[PDB]
Structure formats: C-alpha cells, structure tokens
RNA sequence: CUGUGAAUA
C-alpha cells in the first residue's frame, strides 16, 4: 500500500513501524530494491538522516531486520553512509542481541573496504571481553570467515599474547573464534597472499603449541589442540612438538582425564607410525606408578571410566595399522594388538560387567 | 559404566 509508504515517508512514521514486528514486516516486504527508486530512497533518507534513530533501530528487536533489510539492497553510495553511522558505537553494537546481527550481514554485503574499515575499529578494545561475549564471538567468527586475512592481522597480534590466547580460548564462546581462526588460517586462501597467512598461522600455531599441555586439558581448549594435531603436512611441526614435548610425558595421566583423554584418541587416530610407536613405547614401557600392581599403562586404562576409550581408539588405529604396506609397520601394530588382547582375555570377567568391557571385547571378538 | 564445546520476530 502506498498510503501507507507516504505517511511514513510525509509524517515521519518510521520509528513507530521499524519497532513494531508487523509494521517492520511491512517495510522489509515494500522496501524496493531498486535503489533509483523514488519510495526505497526517502525511506533509506529517513532512516539513516538521525545518526541516534539509526542506532537505536539497529539494537531494537524488530528494528534491526529492517536495517539488514536496506543493507541486503545498498549499493556504495548508501554503505558509505550505514558504515560511517555503524563505526561511531561499533563495540558496543557487536555487544547487542540485536545489533550484533546487522553487524554481521554488514561484514557480509559491505565492499570489503568498508566492512575492513569497520572491523579495523576494534583493533584497540576490549577483545577478550567481546570474543568471549555471547553475542559479540559471533561477530569476530563472521570477520575471520568472511573478510581477507589482512582485515584482521591485528586479531592474530592479539591472540599472540599467551595471556589473551589462554583466556579466550578456554571460554565456551572464545574457543569457537580460536578454532576459526585457525580453521581459516590453515586453509588455503589462493587469492590472497601466500606468505602473509602463513607468518600468521605460524604465529597462532606456536601459541596453542606453547601453551598445549594446558589447553589440552581444558574444558573448551581441547577441541583447538585435537584440530593443530590433525593439520598436518606444513604444520606437522605442531603437531610432532605437541605429541613429543607434551603427550609422551603425559599419555596416562591425561587418558583418565574428561578432556585431555579426546585429545590422546585424536593422537592415536590421526599420527603418523613414527608418532604412533613411540606413544605405544610409553604405554608399555614408560614410567608406570606402582609397577607391583601395574605390568603396564594398560593395567590402569582398561578399566578406567575415561581410559577405556584410548584403549578402544589404540585397537582400532592397530586393526587398521596392520594393513600397512610396510611389513616392519604391520608387525608392530599386530603386536600391539595382541598384547591388548591377552590383557582383555586375562581380564575378561571383571571387564564383562561393565559397558566398556563389553565394547572392548566386541571389538576385538570381531576379528 | 560408559565420556566434552555458540546470539534475534
């Protein structure tokens, strides 16, 4: 209807729809794309004229399916506008429930000089606060997914600080930004330049890396270790310092812990045989606590509620080792099995009445 | 006796 578009228009009725769910429907389905037209340009001029009624719309509940609205239509004319508008409280914005996701359409339908312009407005804030932030992390996720690497250097200078890397990446929202950043960084972004992402990957590789004893053991972290160990080829440096200069010393302790146990399945799924042997190496011939009791790691593992899960991961990474081109690789991992499953067979009856002993036993009956 | 990770109408 157009009566209702020129009272809007003539009447300066755009506060009382945009906050209104039914007259905010109205506007998003009677906006024209167009933007020579005469309606979509004295609704855009009305909207964007008041810099605080702007803003206000973009945190308001209807308000801001409106604004990702004009945004989804703008050309550059209209993004320099809505840019400049959303760079003078942008911290703020990506704090809002609402206005967090007209920041996030704006990253994506901005020229990608304005969306780096405004991303660059974060560059010296509060950026553990807004990682971690419920709403805020979702912002800094669509950045690194979205933007070029060189938008966003300074998240990766952030992050450089173990202090910062630390914090962020062992919080509930803060560890699914690291592992974006990394998931994004360790890809291979053809059309940007090369050596750029690299000196950044490498710089947040070595962070996790340097701090991966704690972070492995983490709630949230564990998720960021158990992806660096799975990267591989030019990051197989990472993985091998993590696995040698963390694991090997701490494979028993960290299969009977909720967190760190997912990180030494990973280890033992996805490491290759050089890796793979010498973790087997301390299972059975480490340091072992009270050896009068225990023969080896298996005699704690088997029948440990977390333990047990390595245990079945080290079964399977020998069922499938055995089929290993090289001879002196299969006879290895044959023997590893069959020194699992004699210790299974010598313990069968206590590892019977518990779900994880029937698992293991099914496991290796089916061979 | 089975074991872990996100914000709008």
């Given at each position: 209807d157009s009566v209702t578009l020129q009272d809007v228009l003539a009447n300066d009725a755009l506060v009382e729809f945009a906050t209104d769910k039914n007259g905010c429907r109205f506007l998003q389905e009677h906006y024209p794309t167009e933007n020579d037209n005469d309606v979509h340009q004295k609704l855009f001029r009305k909207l964007v004229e008041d810099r605080a009624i702007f803003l206000s719309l973009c945190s308001n509940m209807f308000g801001n399916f409106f604004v990702q609205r004009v945004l989804e239509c703008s050309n550059t004319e209209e993004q320099e506008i809505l840019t400049e508008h959303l760079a003078t409280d942008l911290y703020n914005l990506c704090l809002d429930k609402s206005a967090c996701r007209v920041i996030q359409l704006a990253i994506q339908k901005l020229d990608v000089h304005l969306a780096t312009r405004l991303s660059l407005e974060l560059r010296d804030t509060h950026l553990v606060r807004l990682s971690i932030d419920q709403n805020g992390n979702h912002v800094i996720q669509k950045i690194v997914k979205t933007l070029p690497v060189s938008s966003w250097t300074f998240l990766v200078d952030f992050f450089a600080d173990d202090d910062n890397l630390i914090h962020v990446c062992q919080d509930k929202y803060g560890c699914r930004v690291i592992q974006s950043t990394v998931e994004t960084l360790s890809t291979d972004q053809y059309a940007q330049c090369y050596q750029h992402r690299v000196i950044l990957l490498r710089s947040l590789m070595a962070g996790v890396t340097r701090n991966c004893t704690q972070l492995a053991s983490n709630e949230f972290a564990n998720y960021v270790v158990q992806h660096v160990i799975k990267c591989g080829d030019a990051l197989a440096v990472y993985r091998d310092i993590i696995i040698e200069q963390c694991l090997l010393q701490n494979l028993l302790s960290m299969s009977q812990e909720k967190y760190a146990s997912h990180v030494v399945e990973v280890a033992f799924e996805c490491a290759p045989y050089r890796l793979v042997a010498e973790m087997m190496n301390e299972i059975f011939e480490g340091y072992i606590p009270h050896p009068d009791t225990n023969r080896d790691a298996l005699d704690i593992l088997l029948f440990h509620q977390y333990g047990n899960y390595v245990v079945q991961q080290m079964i399977q990474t020998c069922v499938l080792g055995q089929?290993?081109?090289?001879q002196k690789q299969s006879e290895m991992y044959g023997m590893w099995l069959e020194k699992i499953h004699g210790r299974v067979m010598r313990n069968a009856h206590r590892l019977e009445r518990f779900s994880s002993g029937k698992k293991i036993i099914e496991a290796l009956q089916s061979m």
């Open positions: 089929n290993a081109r090289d």
